[PDB]
Amino acid sequence: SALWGMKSVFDMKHSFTEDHYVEFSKHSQDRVIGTKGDIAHIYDIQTGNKLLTLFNPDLANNYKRNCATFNPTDDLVLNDGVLWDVRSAQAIHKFDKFNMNISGVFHPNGLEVIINTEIWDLRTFHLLHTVPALDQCRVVFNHTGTVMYGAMLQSPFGSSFRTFNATDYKPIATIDVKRNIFDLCTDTKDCYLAVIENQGSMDALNMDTVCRLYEVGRQ
Amino acid sequence: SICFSFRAVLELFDRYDGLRRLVNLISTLEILNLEDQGALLSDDEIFASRQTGKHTCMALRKYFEAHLAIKLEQVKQSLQRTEGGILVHPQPPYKACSYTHEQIVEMMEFLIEYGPAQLYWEPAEVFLKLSCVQLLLQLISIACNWKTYYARNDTVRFALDVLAILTVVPKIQLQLAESVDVLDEAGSTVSTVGISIILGVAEGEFFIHDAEIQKSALQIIINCVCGPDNKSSEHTLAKMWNVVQSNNGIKVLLSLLSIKMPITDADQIRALACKALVGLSRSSTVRQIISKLPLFSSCQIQQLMKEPVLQDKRSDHVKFCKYAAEL
Amino acid sequence: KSSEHTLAKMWNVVQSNNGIKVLLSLLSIKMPITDADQIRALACKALVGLSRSSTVRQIISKLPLFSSCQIQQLMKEPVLQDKRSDHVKFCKYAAEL
């Protein structure tokens, strides 16, 4: 990873060599967490040290794609689909494994844990729902957290769109792109879709990846 | 392998050292010594050292089928006490090992559940004071990846039928996850529980076209989840519910409840898998977790109406529906 | 007694040129996942039309369509977005069948 600077001077301020995937923290942005494999490391941006490395082999689901994420109150970590107390450095509860790939994301209401298609609790750890259209997709929210997006990571890549509601999960619309979708990002002020789609057919020798913009809510 | 049917053969087997002269064969196997596994590479001490344990597990296999019917005689005579039993016992030379792991050795493993739940075996005391059930996990571990036919398909299958008679011991179900001294295919000393290996077998990522192995695997699970109701003996079975719920045991059974490729024993696996769900879903947390799945959305019903193999229809499909409306 | 005979002849030609083969496959099509529900409801409408034919009643009624999975195309809701739009007019043609 490369912690750059975009104020006026372009330089890697700190440097990480170990972890595959990092993220900022939501409420207080003084934390950047990092994870290679299945081990999560909490870092700082001021000093760059391992603040709290948490990993327990006794309680690891051991997925294929782990992505350590914070709740928007910045108190819980999803390392391998496990809740993590950042206060006294102990594990909380493990979730069951169902599709070998995706470790788990938070939902922006601070009430749930979205394992790949299992919709959990935060205080009693029960199941609310299970949607068959959440088979191995990565989720994209609005900035307020009121609509959810879905892109398939099947081998094809994202045959169409997937637009969910962030309250009761009744699906809104799946509009169709004939090409294959790779990356999908939206605005904080909720007006565009950065769509990295794949021109041409399934060819490893020729990948033409144009960028296309979509306007939110217009025929 | 055969002469254990005569009881005086086992009687002289235990007045001497017994399994101390048997386990010393397996513990001296240089194909098991991880610290010295890269020492010998000549094919003289490989094909002969991957055959020696194979006949040793079969020496164990008819050893425990015999001692299952021995202790069943020490159950059906000491517990029944003329209530459905006849006290005539000459100690004869007579073959009474029931001779069928397809039907009745499977059945004798079930009636030991009605015992005292304080099961004491001299087959078990020498076993767990030596504590070589961890070694049994290493026999199943190394046999996963040989891939050049050292008669290895039966070798793990003979290793599994050591387990299915031993798994009714309560304190050996305590030692199914505690000691984790195992190794994997990544070329390093790792640590996983013994239940995850059997579940790794019961999925079928290894041992691709094997059929008797999974049905020898599911009898290990059914010994651990579908027991009786009987504040310490209840807690052990409650702990066994928690470890299967811990190490993703709810993942595997939902796939084996729809297996279709070995079309002979298609119906023999699901009825021996649905029996575990009835055992496990008495757990408090696990009731709500299974009840919301797409298993109970639909297609639980549509595994009861198809009759995919019409030949085990009146044989084993109709005992699947005994475990279906029970669920 | 002539205008009835033309529609009766049209039942016979679809029954002649294996028209009962095609509709049993289009009643389970799943690959164009946008109009998955738009094809089956516009295919089941034909079966209600055709199975008024005298011979064809007995022929369809014994198939594995009526063994099972006619019911299991009514409970899945595979495309949840045409659920209140076109899936619920499939069930108008389902209990009609």
N- to C-terminal distance of chain A: 40 Å
Name the shape of chain A in a single word: globular
Largest interface: A-B, 14 and 13 residues
Oligomer description: part of a larger assembly
Number of strand segments of chain A: 18
Look at the helices and sheets of chain A and give the structural class: mainly beta
Query: What spatial order of strands do you see in the largest sheet of chain A?
Result: 3-4-5-6
Rg estimate of chain A, integer Å: 18 Å
Helices and strands of chain A, in N-to-C order?
A: EEEEEEEEEEEEEEEEEE
Percent strand of chain A: 35-45%
Helix content of chain A: under 10%
Count of helix runs of chain A = 0
Largest sheet data of chain A: 4 strands, antiparallel
